[PDB]
Write a protein that binds this ligand. Structure first.
Ligand code: ATP
Ligand code: ADP
Ligand code: ADP
Ligand code: ADP
Lengths: 206, 127, 1585
């Protein structure tokens, strides 16, 4: 709680940064600088998309999750260090997908989670992002191709940035991109409007 | 009219219900060197009585004779546990910041310093 | 001021109270501080500042001289440790001696002394800091421990007992021929170094202890290397178990397991290594079967490790693919060892999830290894992840889910000793900051158990410190600047935090830590592995059944506060299994019997049945001790019961193992009995002698329990607990080496007391004391808590203690009757037949119906049937003993009739003294119906006299006593009910039973008590009136004035023939403490039950032999009364002193009216009608008025006593009266005593017309209304109706005399204030007269009181506790030496403490106060009264003169003293005057006779303006509690003053205008202006009014 006399002799301002998924990925990539190989950069890319997805799903208090959590840059930093350590000593390129999946789900991005179904849906998101097949459909629209053996950091960075720049953020991204049914967000905004209308009815009685 | 009621009280003591601490500042500005503040203390009140200095006390029971003008003329004031000589120019003020015993309330000249919906209506009409 | 200050400064000296010579000490600091704190003024100020400087020097020099004596007087090695340091403290000793000399025989010199003191303090602080720079593990301890360690250098000891502290997990050191060869762990494991530590005389503690820990690191490394080599040589682990210490075998075995598992993981091979692990496990179990204790603990720890290895390999062989194989292997802890690293202690690193950390090679002892569950591995993984990037782990979850011991297990598995700060409010900033700095210096990782419990400022400070440490950790800075020091920082250190939300981590710590959840500890695998390591052949099924049983117990039964069915209870059951394993073997029987021995004592009744049914559902299924218990019970008379036998066997089997046992049950259920008989049987069986101790908790304080530093002398004091602990721990007499000791707290559990008892309770068997006294707890020191409820039992104690629950009473009615009869027989050719007759008297077929038809009635101070039969049988036995003299010479029918009558009366007075009289009658016919009509039937007035039937009406004395005795309140009138009460009270007092008197106020409980005991020559009474705040020194001071000690060990009455009885009043009045308990009542229970107590400054058992306890109290239903717990009331009986019937009132007051007609016997034939009139009016007032209408509507015979007292004093102070005049005077007194607190004048006139009807019914007469009555003695020599005109003339003459003499206050005169001053004069002229003043502010009540005080010639005074008592003493001294009739006034603003109200209550319940007149005061009072003229006669004269020479009148505004008004003793004498608000007539007349001072009529109009003022006043108060008239009065005063000033100003202005017009008489304009002014002047004047 802020002290009483400071908040009165001041101009109180409240902000809301844009919750779009695309701007989070672009901000993460601009904050990023890559420096070790190409597979580490590709895994950092996948991890940044995963962090963007979980940050988008955080705001859905009663349907996307069960309690408003607070992720930040430090959790993504630790996950990035874990990814670069895993793909810095396991140079056989036989990717230990189970190791990174379990360590991200149950330790890095499950450290602050107490409920069980929240961890189950985090594990589902990990399985979706880190399926480790020959193709990846991170959303039903765009694909992130796997790198090849004949690239350095600069060309892979350029190629993945081009994959960012082609697709525009869709209007209904809050259900298709997060893999959530439309009726769920419909009920969420229904409860939002119910709270707003009930509050206005209570204020209208005076 | 608050300050008019304050200055037109030569018999009953006035009350300063001023959590904003503006009344004490304007009173001290008007008075100057004759202002002493309290919150030992009996001794300094007796010294102020003997010297003839106006006293203001914050956070408003042994000042019964002074608040009731129960003076002995031979003019001495029996305050606390010893008689104190009266200079004749002694004045007392009571200040508080909490918006109170019944005996004090029915004796002190109570005034209110509170802004409310009536106050904002008067303010918008005045502007 | 100046003279007193100079005199006390020149009188300053010192007290010779110190030990040996030392420094001459001084006490009473605070009085000196309160006393001490132009040229002459500045000189005095400078002297005061110098004196304050010397005062600060004094307190600092003694506060430091205590430690100076501690470290220099008793030992010189501390001051001789180092050369320059030795010179510095030799100079210190020289300075100390010379300042002692100059203190014996200046101020600036002593300021130079404090300068020297501060620089030597800085020198020693820097010396300690440099010693800790040499060895930062010394910086763990406080300064005193450092001084002890450096003093015992050549002594070479006392570091072996701090050996627990500075290295964590080591108990003691061992050393041969002045050379250390190893250390002994906390478990007790011997260690051997690489080489012995050769020692010299010139040794410092720091250097050889650095050698000690460096070489213990090297030695554990050496044994690990040798064990690794020997295991690489193919040696089986079973042989080499006993060779190497636990750390070595753990590290070597885990490294070998890592190497073998990665070798077999490089291929798809798991069978051979799993078979090898299984063979190792089986061989280790076989060796565990035949091991010694050290071998057993090493083997169980290695079995924990190898069960983990078995689980890991079994998990890995389920890995069908290689990727999940690396998944599973990379997550568990991997133990690698370097090969080419030349550094010995950095050759091993631990790999966990791709990271690595450095082992530090410190000994860990052999603690209970945390069994390896997957969640433990996940916690290790996330802690490794946090630590890898220079961060700190944060843990959060539910309470007791495995956080802090998980961090300690991390420290164990990484080989580090972790310091745990057990968070509590007693922690402060400096010691926690010091331990944090030590953790930074030495690099030892540190956990924080339950971090959220700190206070706000301390949590913020430690958060800042931890943030600085972390910030230094990430940036790699080796010098963090905190605590004003640039302390070194090893990169291997860490900081750990654990907490429980439901708060979370603070944001400053949250930005640099990482969270984790561990909500559900996997109990199934823990139980499975514990059952496997215990040796049971069936681990999985038994563990699953135990988990199912625990969850079903936690779900099905009612969730009691003390219940727990989680993990710690499961581990306690598994630990308790092993002694049952040794007898019953391994199987289901052992665990089911352990469950029957552990969880069964904590269960209830329905929970017990649920547990039994679930035990039958899940699970399928020694008499020498039973015989011993039966023999003990049969010897002591406790006839056993099946429930009682089950409970006693349960308690014995529970105390077989667990040290700390708590007994819980409703009061009076046999807890004391069951542990007494169990421990007697235990002493018979095992042969050890028993010693028991009983201590009451709340009556003693913590200072009297343990002790503290003294406020001035700083001297340690030994409390009771410290005394008994020192006695049982010294064992100088040799008793406590084979004698069993039982410290039992016969009191309810207190949270702030169990907070101190946790230091007793903890596992290390050490206690925390302010003076630094460490005391061990031997195995015979068993602690027992017997309580009555668990309302305040902390859940931290419901599991960590041992709990026994007594849901149902373990005794039957028949067995209790038999035991009580046998005890009464043993309490004493004829005794045998008498015992047989009493045994056959209790025909239980009718007694059962008696109990069933007696428990239904309303029991005031309700007690069950289980605690009144004690009183019943004891009264029956005592009456039989009294009548035993004439029972051998009489026929059997008379004997059976007499014993039947006696038991009938005993049951009637033990089962109906808690209900009304008609309930007693109905009980007596119920008894006569149950026992049949064959025997003698007890009647309401039945009595047996010398030997046949009689009645109470035979012995009643119809005494025609004198007239003046009604002024004396101690005189008693006799009646049948009074004699019955006295007889039963006398029997109860003689029967050695407790007495409690209850009933509505006004029945005369104290009055009948003083009747029964003043006439009693066999006893004495000391009476104490209780207060809201009551202390144990009240009762001690009360008894010391009439009792004496003797050996002390025994407290006896001062007389040798009179059994002294302590009386107390208003037991319900004292308030509860902060935890719902009261100390005085438990003290009384301790006196009345165990006949002994403990002295608070001496801790001695003061046995009581000839003192009984009686008590009179108001019922708890009334306001200001709090109920007592049944524990106190179970020892006593209840006598409902109800309201006597109106016929008894008529008889009592017709003797009173004969006595009052003695003075004027011309109307001696009218005693009865006035008694009937008083009875009728009081009965109608009771049936009409009720306390719902107003708080002070309480009616009693106190009104009638005051009525007859007023009539008597009127007749004494009055002339000859006719019949009509006497009727009128009696009506005047009745209206005064009754119609002064009623609702309104309508109630007064209703009382008047009822009085009319009753008088004309009894005495066959005009208007006798309120205002028509005016009785005074101002205008007549004696009380008679005087004329109002001459009365107001006389009081007007006195008013003008007073205004010309002393004070000319602005007062008025009207008939209302005439009535007020007449009433207050009537009260002041009466002996012991007081009033309340229910009036608003500025109503002139105090002014009228002062007026009447001057009229009566009363001396005038203007009123902390000590000053109040000194003023009282001066006033009573002036009263005794000068007959000073001084009036005293108290307002509500005059009273701020309830002690003044309490002493008013005491002195007005009595006529004086006993405990304020004792010692020197009593001796001087007796001497002075002998100067004015036996102690009793002089004190009676003192009581009479203070009754006739004291008058206090109280002023109240709100009708916090409501309970004081409702207090019967306060209400007894003072007449409550409802001044109220002024009425319309009163305000109109006061306005109309103030307006006449100032002429205003120039335009009637006075009535108009007064009507407007009063109507606006009423409208303001009705559109805006008595209505305050202050607004009206100061409004009219200000109006009068403004009118006077404005009239004078207008007269001057009109005179000036007339002068100007006359001077003026161009002129046309001036004439027009003057004419316009003269024309508008009248309109402006009306507008001006
Ligand atoms: N086997 C028995 N047969 C008959 N009466 C028994 C038996 N065991 C105990 N009693 C009775 O039970 C009574 C219990 O006394 P007490 O009130 O001290 O019990 P408690 O449960 O320890 O309670 P507290 O300590 O609160 O007083 C004994 O005074 C005794 O008369
Ligand atoms: N290997 C283990 N895994 C889980 N719990 C354990 C293990 N070993 C012991 N325990 C028990 O778990 C309990 C956890 O309590 P704890 O969290 O330390 O309480 P607190 O939070 O008050 O410190 C301990 O009492 C301990 O007996
Ligand atoms: N039967 C009676 N005989 C004589 N006096 C009585 C009788 N009943 C009541 N009184 C008078 O009424 C008063 C009762 O007050 P009491 O109940 O003793 O007050 P408290 O309980 O506060 O001491 C006594 O002072 C006593 O003088
Ligand atoms: N009945 C009255 N008649 C005249 N003056 C009054 C009366 N009551 C109060 N006053 C004025 O009020 C002042 C203070 O009264 P105070 O003593 O406070 O009343 P109370 O005794 O009820 O507390 C007095 O100086 C007196 O002049």
């Amino acid at each position: 709680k802020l002290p009483a006399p400071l908040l009165q002799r001041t101009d109180r301002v409240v902000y809301e940064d844009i919750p779009g998924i695309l701007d989070t990925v672009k901000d993460l990539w601009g904050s990023q600088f890559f420096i070790s190989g190409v597979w580490s950069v590709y895994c950092t890319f996948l991890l940044s998309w995963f962090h963007a997805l979980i940050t988008a799903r955080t705001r859905l208090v009663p349907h996307g999750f069960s309690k408003k959590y607070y992720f930040n840059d430090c959790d993504f930093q630790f996950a990035s260090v874990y990814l670069e350590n895993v793909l810095a000593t396991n140079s056989t390129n036989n990717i230990p997908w189970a190791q990174v999946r379990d360590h991200i789900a149950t330790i890095v991005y499950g450290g602050k989670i107490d409920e069980e179904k929240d961890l189950e849906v985090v594990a589902k998101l990990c399985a979706h992002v880190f399926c480790g097949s020959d193709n990846l459909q991170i959303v039903p629209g765009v694909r992130i191709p796997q790198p090849l053996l004949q690239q350095s950091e600069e060309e892979e960075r350029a190629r993945l940035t081009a994959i960012l720049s082609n697709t525009i953020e869709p209007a209904d991204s809050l259900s298709s991109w997060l893999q959530l049914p439309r009726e769920s967000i419909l009920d969420y905004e229904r409860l939002q409007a119910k709270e707003v209308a009930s509050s206005t009815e209570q204020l209208l009685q005076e | 009219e608050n300050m008019s009621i304050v200055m037109n009280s030569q018999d009953a003591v006035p009350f300063l219900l001023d959590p904003s601490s503006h009344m004490i500042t304007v009173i001290s500005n008007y008075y100057g060197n004759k202002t002493v503040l309290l919150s030992g203390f009996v001794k300094r009140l007796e010294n102020a009585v003997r010297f003839g200095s106006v006293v203001i006390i914050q956070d408003g029971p042994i000042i019964s004779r002074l608040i009731s003008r129960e003076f002995n003329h031979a003019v001495t004031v029996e305050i606390g546990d010893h008689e104190v000589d009266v200079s004749g120019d002694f004045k007392l003020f009571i200040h508080s910041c909490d918006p109170i015993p019944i005996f004090l309330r029915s004796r002190v000249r109570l005034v209110h310093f509170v802004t409310n919906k009536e106050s904002i209506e008067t303010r918008i009409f005045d502007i | 001021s100046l003279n007193r200050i100079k005199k006390f400064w020149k009188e300053a000296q010192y007290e010779v109270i110190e030990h040996s010579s030392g420094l001459k000490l001084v006490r009473e600091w605070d009085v000196l501080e309160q006393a001490c704190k132009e040229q002459d003024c500045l000189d005095l100020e400078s002297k005061l500042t110098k004196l304050s400087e010397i005062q600060v020097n004094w307190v600092e020099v003694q506060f430091y001289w205590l430690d100076l004596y501690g470290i220099l007087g008793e030992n010189l090695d501390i001051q001789n440790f180092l050369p320059l340091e030795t010179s510095k403290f030799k100079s210190l000793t020289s300075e100390y001696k010379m300042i002692t000399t100059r203190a014996f025989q200046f101020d600036t010199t002593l300021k130079l002394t404090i300068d020297s003191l501060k620089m030597i303090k800085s020198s020693l602080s820097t010396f300690l800091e440099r010693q800790r720079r040499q060895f930062p593990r010394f910086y763990f301890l406080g300064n005193d421990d450092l001084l002890k360690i450096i003093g015992s250098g050549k002594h070479h000891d006392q570091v072996s007992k701090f050996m627990k502290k500075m290295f964590g997990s080591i108990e003691s050191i061992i050393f041969f021929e002045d050379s250390i060869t190893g250390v002994r762990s906390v478990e007790g494991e011997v260690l051997n170094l690489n080489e012995k530590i050769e020692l010299k005389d010139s040794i410092q503690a720091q250097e050889w202890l650095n050698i000690l820990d460096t070489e213990i690191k090297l030695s554990v490394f050496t044994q690990f290397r040798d064990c690794l080599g020997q295991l690489k040589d193919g040696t089986d682990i079973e042989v080499v178990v006993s060779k190497y210490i636990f750390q070595a075998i753990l590290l070597s075995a885990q490294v070998m397991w890592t190497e073998l598992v990665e070798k077999c993981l490089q291929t798809n091979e798991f069978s051979k290594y799993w078979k090898e692990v299984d063979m190792k496990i089986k061989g280790l179990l076989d060796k565990l079967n035949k091991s010694s204790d050290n071998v057993k603990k090493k083997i169980e720890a290695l079995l924990v490790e190898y069960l983990h290895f078995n689980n890991v390999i079994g998990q890995l062989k389920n890995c069908s693919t290689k990727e999940e194989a690396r998944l599973l292997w990379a997550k568990v802890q991997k133990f690698y060892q370097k090969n080419d690293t030349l550094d010995d202690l950095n050759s091993v690193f631990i790999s966990q999830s791709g990271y690595l950390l450095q082992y530090k090679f410190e000994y860990i002892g052999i603690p209970e290894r945390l069994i390896y569950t997957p969640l433990l591995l996940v916690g290790f993984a996330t802690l490794t992840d946090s630590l890898h990037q220079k961060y700190g782990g944060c843990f959060f979850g539910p309470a007791g889910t495995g956080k802090t011991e998980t961090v300690k297990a991390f420290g164990q598995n990484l080989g580090r000793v972790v310091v745990v700060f057990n968070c509590d409010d007693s922690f402060d900033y400096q010691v926690l900051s010091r331990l944090l700095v030590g953790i930074t210096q030495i690099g030892a990782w540190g956990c924080f158990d339950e971090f959220n419990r700190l206070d706000e400022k301390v949590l913020s400070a430690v958060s800042a410190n931890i943030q600085q440490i972390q910030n230094g950790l990430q940036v790699g800075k080796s010098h963090i600047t905190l605590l004003e020091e640039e302390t070194p920082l090893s990169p291997h250190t860490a900081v750990f935090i654990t907490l429980n939300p439901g708060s979370e981590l603070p944001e400053n710590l949250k930005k640099s830590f990482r969270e984790f959840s561990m909500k559900s500890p996997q109990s199934g695998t823990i139980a499975e592995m514990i059952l496997q390591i215990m040796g049971f052949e069936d681990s999985k099924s038994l563990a699953s059944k135990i988990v199912h049983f625990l969850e079903l117990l936690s779900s099905k039964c009612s969730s009691m506060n003390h219940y727990h069915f989680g993990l710690r209870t499961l581990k306690g059951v598994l630990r308790n299994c092993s002694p049952l394993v040794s007898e019953f073997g391994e199987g289901e029987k052992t665990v089911v019997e352990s469950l029957k021995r552990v969880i069964l004592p904590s269960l209830g009744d329905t929970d017990e049945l649920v547990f039994k049914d679930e035990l039958s559902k899940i699970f399928d299924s020694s008499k020498a001790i039973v015989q011993c218990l039966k023999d003990a019970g049969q010897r002591s008379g406790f006839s056993m019961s099946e429930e009682f036998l089950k409970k006693c066997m349960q308690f014995y089997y529970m105390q077989k193992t667990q040290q700390a046992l708590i007994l819980v049950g409703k009061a009076g259920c046999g807890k004391t009995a069951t542990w007494k008989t169990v421990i007697d049987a235990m002493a018979i069986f095992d042969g050890h002698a028993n010693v028991v101790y009983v201590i009451d908790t709340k009556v003693l304080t913590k200072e009297s329990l343990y002790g503290s530093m003294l406020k001035a002398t700083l001297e340690w004091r030994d409390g009771l607990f410290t005394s008994i602990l020192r006695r049982v721990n010294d064992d100088i007499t040799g008793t406590f080496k084979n004698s069993r000791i039982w410290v039992v707290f016969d009191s309810d559990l207190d949270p702030e007391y169990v907070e101190a008892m946790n230091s007793v309770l903890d596992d290390n068997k050490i206690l925390t004391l302010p003076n630094g006294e460490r005391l061990p707890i031997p195995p015979n020191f068993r602690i027992l808590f017997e309580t009555d409820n668990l309302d305040h039992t902390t859940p931290a104690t419901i599991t960590r203690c041992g709990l026994l629950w007594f849901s149902t009473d373990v005794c039957s009615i028949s067995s209790k009757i038999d035991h009580l009869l046998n005890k009464s027989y043993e309490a004493l050719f004829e005794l045998d037949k008498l015992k047989d007759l009493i045994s056959d008297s209790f025909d239980m077929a009718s007694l059962t119906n008696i109990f069933t038809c007696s428990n239904d009635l309303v029991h005031i101070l309700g007690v069950r049937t289980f605690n009144k039969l004690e009183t019943a049988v004891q009264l029956a036995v005592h009456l039989i003993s009294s009548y035993r003299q004439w029972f051998q010479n009489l026929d059997d029918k008379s004997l059976k009739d007499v014993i039947t009558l006696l038991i009938k009366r005993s049951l009637l007075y033990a089962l109906a003294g808690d209900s009304t009289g008609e309930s007693q009658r109905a009980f007596i016919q119920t008894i006569n119906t149950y026992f049949g009509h064959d025997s003698q039937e007890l009647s309401d007035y039945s009595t047996i006299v010398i030997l046949s039937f009689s009645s109470f009406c035979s012995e009643i004395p119809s005494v025609s006593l004198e007239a003046h005795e009604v002024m004396r309140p101690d005189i008693v009138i006799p009646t049948i009910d009074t004699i019955k009460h006295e007889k039963i009270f006398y029997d109860l007092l003689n029967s050695k039973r407790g007495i409690i008197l209850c009933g509505p106020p006004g029945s005369g409980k104290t009055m009948i008590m003083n009747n029964a005991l003043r006439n009693s020559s066999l006893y004495d009474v000391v009476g104490i009136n209780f207060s809201k705040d009551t202390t144990t020194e009240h009762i001690l001071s009360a008894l010391h004035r009439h009792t004496n000690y003797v050996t002390g060990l025994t407290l006896l009455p001062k007389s040798d023939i009179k059994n002294l009885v302590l009386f107390c009043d208003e037991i319900n009045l004292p308030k509860l403490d902060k935890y719902g308990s009261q100390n005085v009542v438990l003290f009384l229970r301790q006196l009345m039950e165990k006949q002994g107590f403990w002295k608070t400054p001496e801790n001695k058992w003061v046995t009581i032999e000839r003192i009984h306890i009686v008590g009179a109290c108001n019922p708890p239903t009334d306001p200001g009364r709090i109920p007592m717990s049944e524990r106190f009331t179970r020892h006593a009986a209840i006598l409902y002193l109800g309201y006597p019937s109106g016929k008894s009132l008529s008889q009592i007051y017709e003797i009173y009216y004969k006595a009052i007609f003695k003075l004027v016997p011309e109307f001696r034939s009218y005693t009865e009608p006035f008694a009937r009139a008083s009875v009728h009016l009081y009965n109608e007032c009771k049936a009409r008025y009720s306390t719902g209408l107003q708080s002070h509507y309480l009616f009693s015979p106190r009104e009638l006593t005051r009525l007859v007292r007023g009539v008597y004093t009127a007749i004494n102070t009055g002339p000859r009266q006719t019949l009509r005049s006497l009727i009128r005077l009696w009506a005047y007194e009745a209206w005064r005593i009754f119609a002064d607190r009623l609702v309104g004048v309508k109630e007064k006139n209703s009382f008047e017309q009822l009085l009319y009807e009753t008088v004309d019914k009894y005495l066959p007469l005009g208007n006798i209304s309120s205002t028509s009555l005016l009785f005074s003695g101002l205008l007549s020599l004696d009380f008679k109706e005087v004329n109002k005109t001459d009365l107001v003339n006389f009081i007007e003459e006195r008013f003008k005399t007073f205004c010309d003499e002393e004070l000319e206050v602005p007062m008025v005169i009207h008939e209302s204030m005439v009535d007020h001053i007449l009433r207050i004069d009537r009260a002041l002229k009466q002996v012991q007269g007081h009033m309340m003043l229910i009036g608003a502010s500025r109503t002139g009540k105090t002014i009228l009181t002062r007026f009447v005080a001057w009229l009566n010639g009363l001396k005038i005074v203007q009123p902390n506790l000590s000053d109040f008592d000194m003023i009282l003493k001066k006033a009573i001294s002036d009263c005794s030496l000068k007959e000073s009739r001084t009036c005293l006034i108290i307002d509500e603003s005059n009273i701020l403490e309830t002690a003044f109200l309490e002493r008013m209550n005491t002195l007005l319940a009595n006529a004086d106060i006993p405990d304020l007149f004792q010692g020197e005061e009593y001796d001087k009072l007796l001497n002075n009264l002998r100067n004015k003229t036996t102690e009793q006669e002089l004190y009676d004269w003192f009581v009479g003169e203070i009754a006739k020479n004291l008058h206090v009148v109280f002023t109240i505004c709100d009708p916090k003293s409501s309970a004081m008004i409702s207090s019967p003793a306060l209400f007894n004498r003072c007449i409550i005057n409802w001044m109220g608000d002024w009425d319309t007539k009163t305000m109109s007349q006061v306005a109309n006779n103030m307006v006449d001072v100032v002429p205003m009529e120039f335009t009637t109009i006075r009535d108009a303006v007064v009507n407007i003022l009063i109507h606006f006043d009423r409208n303001f108060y009705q559109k805006m509690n008595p209505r305050s008239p202050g607004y009206f009065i100061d409004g009219l005063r200000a109006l009068v003053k403004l009118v006077t000033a404005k009239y004078q100003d207008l007269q001057e202005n009109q005179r000036f205008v007339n002068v100007g017009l006359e001077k003026l008489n161009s002129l046309t304009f001036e004439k027009e202006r003057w004419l316009n002014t003269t024309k508008q002047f009248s309109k402006t004047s009306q507008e001006l009014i």
